[PDB]
């Protein structure tokens, strides 16, 4: 669909284009509203219909396209140890993002769980006392169990074992030779330990 | 003399007091300085998700104000943290009891594409039917049209622009800009020139630099501040000038000098002007009455309701595209009001009364400067990015529990 | 040197047992050959990528064994497959040219040597690929005419099952390791035990006394077998599965015999923590590299050669002149090691352990060494 003289646009390999239209095409329908556009009766209210049904919304951009997003998971997850016990995530909402451009300290990226029954909506500049202390936040942060991810050979091998299994660690030690005068001492004693020991 | 000194005490105090309470009100808030001040600001449809990423990034369309210098269209990246990724169970503060934290996680906001521009950005606008074309409304009579794909990444070491097109018609500077959804190619201005200017690029030539305006509307009798194409009709458009009169225009009539259809839509100059989504009856006004009146195509002669908790002028009024109840508007009284239309003529408390009508459903009150324009994002639900006269660009949204409830 | 893991496993993640490349090949990319648990042997393709990485592709499955394959061995020239099991019965495999669905190449029995009574363990071939020697748990080590498909001699003077067996290079001996904690050299000609050795002393006794124990490990070993070899030019014997009393306590090593005399160890190499059980030796002589002229040298002669000692979960890399091991590789298989090979040309060294998954450990050019122009000419006894 190139458009006189410029090439089409072309989306890329992860682009979504939000849609340029939020209603189904009803054919006829710009015809009827000719005939609105010229009867000009003041039959129809739409605030009174507004309250009568359900607002008409669409959700957030998906991505459509075909064959698209396939992908593949190779680990299973087992949870290993008590940890701290913190308390349940899901009852702490969404993490909110507060960055600020003057602000010295870096991004806030968390969740908020305060309550207040004076800082509305309809008016931001509503203070509440004794909520929140009404100073700058910035200027004292302007200075400053196990969760294994087993692969199918580790879960075959925890599987066989239990919660006891442990995933393995490997240790491989490069060419270290005695003519090396650069290499690690920590390798050269760490292979000296299986020095050969000679008998007479 | 100290009026001035007053003024920037009492909104600096009101910034403190409401970045203080951002946290009740809003779920993202993303503050970025820009160079220079934008007097456009629009959401690309392009939003991208990296595979195995937690964010998506999406672009916005803006200009530069420049009092001596170099005057650039500027294309900016955004990245917003994806839904699924919202919870996560990271760090868990035992002293304020939160799942919170500062960390390094932050939204990038960065410049990607800047193109040279002859004078200010009034208003950047770009072809719904390929994202790539952008018109910009100069300073001068004429419009220019630009490809940023057939431009450098960097500007020209010197020199103007090289716009890919010039549209001639047109004898002063103007605001007012929109495409039309359901015919590529066809562009309609508003400028101080009291006329309105459509143009169809559809046919120009590989060669082709300047193409002459295709029709003139001359029914306003004073400056035309906005106009805008029906989002379903491809022969009807509205436009809101000066002169306090609405008109709905058919490009099917032969008569351009007097419109379709005209309203005395309010008191003093109307500014802004805009087409709701999920109703092709209805569409909105905002004015200098402080006021956005919601009219019906179907009653042309009665002015469905008029939203009055503005208070100062107000220059630029948007829908949710996700929600047809929902409504914007922002002007020079530094907020950006959000209004619910299923809240209209709702009992309410004598105390709740007091901050404003019952439509009214959020305020947006973070900008120490004039709103100069908002936009709303089209992928991702309640996000607004707004831009103000003092270099502020402000990518926001409010709070869940303000709307899903 | 690289160290890749294969994560899937070859032999329907039974346990593999034997390993070697295919001694013939002369070029880049090698031959290699697996056997396990589940009745097959399986020949496999190796190659380095372009960004120095092993890779595996499968060549041919060999299903006639019909229990257990425990040792699989090349032929020197490459072109005899030698497989044995728990089914007693030795396969010689050659490539089927017309002198099976999954097979991309195909391979068939040649000769079917019978004899032994229960599983064998070890197998290993003569310098002229004529005569072979085999290690079973039916406590006999035979030896086979290769080109007459029949057996040729039976020692058993073992005790217990025989879990490894070498050929002398110069063609004068042949060792057996034993569960006995015996090593036993047979004399190549007269077809007796030459040497056996068992005890070893160490130090002096607090009174006086004549300290002696037993050298190898008792059956207390997890590892079916005791794979000793000899050094390709033959100068030493490589015996795992050594026990050194250093104090009041026991440690692992890898005893190392010379051919001056056979019933004392010059050394050994100690593995701390599990006991070794295979050795195998790269096959190219390196020059010597720069180094103080100390007599730490297991052997003083104009080259070296690098060799391998895998233990039960862990794999040493020495050469000759030095003493510490060069290379040092551990944890990267969740059961016990089984067997190592190196390939022709040394880049490749593969490693199988029991619990299914193999992996290999990779050189880049000259990282081992220089290698000699010309490669010793050898004085065979014969």
Same mark, same amino acid.
Request: negative net charge; proline residues 5%; aromatic residues 10%.
């Given at each position: ?200 | ?405 | ?24 090949? =002369? ?5 290699? *050959? +697996? !056997?396990? #648990? @589940?009745?097959?042997?399986? %020949? /496999?393709?190796?190659? &380095? $990528? ?75 071939? =003569? ?5 072979? *020697? +085999? !290690?079973? #748990? @039916?406590?006999?080590?035979? %030896? /086979?005419?290769?080109? &007459? $498909? ?233």
């Amino acid at each position: 669909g190139s458009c006189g003289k410029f090439a089409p646009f072309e989306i890329k390999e992860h682009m979504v284009l939000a849609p340029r239209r939020r209603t189904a095409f009803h054919p006829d329908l710009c015809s009827q509203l000719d005939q609105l556009l010229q009867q000009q009766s003041g039959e129809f209210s739409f605030l009174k219909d507004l309250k009568g049904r359900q607002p008409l919304r669409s959700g957030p951009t998906h991505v459509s396209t075909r064959n698209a997003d396939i992908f593949n998971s190779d680990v299973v997850i087992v949870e290993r140890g008590k940890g701290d016990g913190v308390p349940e995530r899901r009852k702490f909402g969404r993490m909110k993002l507060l960055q600020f451009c003057e602000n010295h300290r870096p991004a806030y990226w968390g969740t908020w769980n305060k309550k207040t029954a004076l800082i509305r909506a309809r008016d931001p500049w509503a203070q509440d006392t004794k909520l929140l202390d009404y100073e700058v936040d910035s200027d004292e942060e302007w200075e400053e169990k196990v969760r294994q991810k087993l692969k199918a050979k580790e879960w075959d091998e925890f599987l066989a074992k239990g919660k006891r299994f442990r995933v393995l660690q490997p240790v491989k030690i490069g060419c270290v030779w005695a003519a090396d005068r650069d290499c690690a001492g920590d390798d050269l004693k760490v292979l000296q330990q299986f020095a050969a020991c000679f008998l007479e | 003399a100290f009026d001035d000194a007053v003024e920037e005490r009492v909104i600096n105090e009101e910034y403190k007091i409401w970045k203080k309470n951002t946290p009740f009100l809003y779920d993202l808030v993303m503050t970025h300085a820009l160079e220079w001040p934008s007097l456009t600001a629009q959401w690309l449809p392009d939003v991208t998700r990296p595979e195995g990423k937690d964010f998506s990034i999406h672009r916005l369309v803006l200009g530069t104000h420049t009092s001596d210098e170099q005057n650039h269209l500027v294309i900016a990246s955004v990245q917003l943290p994806n839904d699924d990724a919202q919870f996560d169970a990271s760090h868990y503060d035992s002293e304020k009891g939160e799942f919170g934290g500062f960390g390094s996680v932050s939204g990038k906001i960065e410049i990607e594409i800047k193109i040279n521009h002859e004078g200010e950005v009034n208003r950047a606008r770009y072809m719904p039917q390929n994202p790539c074309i952008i018109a910009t409304k100069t300073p001068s009579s004429d419009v220019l049209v630009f490809d940023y794909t057939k431009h450098p990444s960097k500007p020209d070491p010197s020199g103007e622009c090289n716009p890919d097109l010039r549209l001639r018609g047109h004898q002063k500077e103007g605001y007012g800009l929109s495409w039309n959804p359901n015919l590529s190619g066809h562009l309609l201005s508003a400028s101080d020139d009291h006329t309105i200017c459509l143009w169809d690029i559809s046919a120009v030539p590989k060669e082709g630099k300047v193409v002459d305006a295709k029709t003139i509307f001359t029914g306003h009798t004073a400056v035309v501040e906005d106009v805008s194409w029906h989002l379903l009709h491809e022969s009807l458009f509205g436009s809101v000038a000066d002169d306090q009169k609405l008109m709905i225009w058919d490009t099917r009539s032969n008569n351009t000098s007097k419109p379709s259809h005209s309203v005395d839509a309010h008191t003093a100059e109307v500014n802004c002007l805009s087409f709701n989504p999920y109703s092709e009856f209805i569409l909105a006004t905002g004015s200098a009455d402080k006021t956005v009146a919601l009219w019906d195509l179907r009653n042309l002669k009665l002015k469905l309701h008029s939203f009055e908790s503005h208070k100062d002028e107000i220059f630029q009024v948007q829908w949710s595209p996700h929600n047809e109840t929902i409504l914007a508007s922002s002007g020079t009284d530094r907020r950006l009001n959000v209004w619910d239309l299923s809240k209209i003529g709702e009992e309410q408390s004598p105390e709740d009364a007091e901050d404003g009508p019952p439509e009214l459903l959020f305020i947006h009150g973070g900008h120490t400067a004039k709103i100069s324009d908002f936009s709303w994002n089209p992928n991702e639900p309640w996000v607004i990015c707004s831009v103000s006269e003092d270099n502020i660009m402000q990518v926001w949204q409010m709070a869940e529990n303000i709307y899903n409830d | 040197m690289k160290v890749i893991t294969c994560e899937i496993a070859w032999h329907n993640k039974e346990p593999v047992y034997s390993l070697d490349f295919q001694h013939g090949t =002369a070029g880049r990319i090698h031959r290699l *050959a +697996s !056997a396990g #648990v @589940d009745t097959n042997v399986r %020949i /496999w393709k190796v190659e &380095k $990528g372009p960004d120095g990485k092993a890779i595996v592709e499968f060549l041919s499955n060999l299903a006639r064994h019909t229990k257990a394959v425990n040792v699989v061995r090349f032929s020197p020239t490459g072109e005899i497959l030698a497989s044995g099991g728990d089914d007693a019965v030795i396969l010689l495999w050659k490539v089927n040219d017309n002198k099976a669905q999954l097979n991309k190449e195909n391979w068939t029995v040649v000769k079917t040597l019978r004899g032994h009574l229960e599983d064998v363990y070890d197998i290993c071939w =003569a310098t002229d690929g004529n005569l072979m *020697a +085999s !290690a079973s #748990v @039916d406590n006999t080590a035979i %030896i /086979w005419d290769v080109s &007459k $498909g029949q057996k040729i001699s039976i020692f058993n003077e073992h005790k217990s099952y025989v879990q490894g067996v070498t050929w002398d290079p110069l063609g004068q001996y042949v060792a057996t390791l034993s569960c006995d904690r015996v090593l036993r050299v047979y004399s190549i000609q007269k077809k007796r035990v030459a040497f056996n050795v068992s005890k070893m002393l160490s130090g002096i006794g607090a009174e006086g006394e004549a300290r002696s124990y037993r050298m190898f490990h008792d059956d207390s070993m997890k590892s079916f077998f005791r794979r000793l070899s000899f050094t390709p030019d033959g100068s030493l014997l490589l015996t795992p599965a050594g026990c050194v009393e250093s104090g009041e306590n026991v440690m692992n090593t890898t005893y190392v015999f010379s051919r001056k005399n056979l019933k004392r160890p010059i050394a050994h190499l100690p593995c701390p923590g599990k006991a070794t059980l295979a050795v195998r030796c790269c096959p190219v002589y390196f020059e010597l590299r720069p180094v103080v002229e100390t007599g730490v040298e297991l052997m003083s002669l104009p080259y070296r050669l690098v060799f391998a000692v895998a233990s039960e979960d862990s794999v040493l890399l020495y050469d000759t002149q030095q003493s510490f091991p060069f290379g040092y590789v551990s944890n990267i298989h969740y059961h016990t090691l089984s067997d190592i090979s190196w390939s022709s040309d040394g880049a490749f060294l593969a490693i199988s352990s029991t619990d299914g998954y193999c992996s290999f450990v990779t050189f880049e050019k000259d990282e081992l060494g220089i290698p000699l122009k010309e490669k010793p000419v050898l004085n065979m006894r014969t």
